[PDB]
Amino acid sequence: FXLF
Amino acid sequence: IAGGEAITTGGSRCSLGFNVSVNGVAHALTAGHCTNISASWSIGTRTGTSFPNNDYGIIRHSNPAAADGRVYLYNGSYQDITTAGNAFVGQAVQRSGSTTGLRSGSVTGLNATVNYGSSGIVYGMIQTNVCAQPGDSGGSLFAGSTALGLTSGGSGNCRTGGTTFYQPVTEALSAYGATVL
Questions:
Q1: What pairs make up the disulfide bonds (chain B)?
Q2: Do A1 and B114 touch (CB under 8 A)?
């Protein structure tokens, strides 16, 4: 705010 | 292949979290948002996945001799792993991943809830002030030779810095009856  | 190195599926890239053993069989832990993508990986076949809610998954190695019980430090050296533990606020930690390499920082929170929008919500995440970038997911969060987490996500990057959240490694180990190598 994300996936790595 | 060791902790923090690249693992891919078609065009996708994630990092290996930890090489583990399940009843003597070599497997690798990585993030669950990674393993949801496919069952076929450069290192083997997926045998478990849990995302969202959790963020962990497991892959059985095609080549057992590749199950290296260490974490790559991206400086031609490695850190031996010998145990798995639980993180604590203020702990000095390191994170190894395939985009940014080795970074360090400290645990700033535990049991954090992370809302990834369309990707869903994860719970009970270790929180740190260590940076990460896309490609770094699933890689190792460790303190010395103690395994602590798997990179999930966060905000920011390695130039401006940011916040990162990790899935606690002991919950992934108990989920699959695995032990770190």
A1: 14-34, 131-158
A2: yes
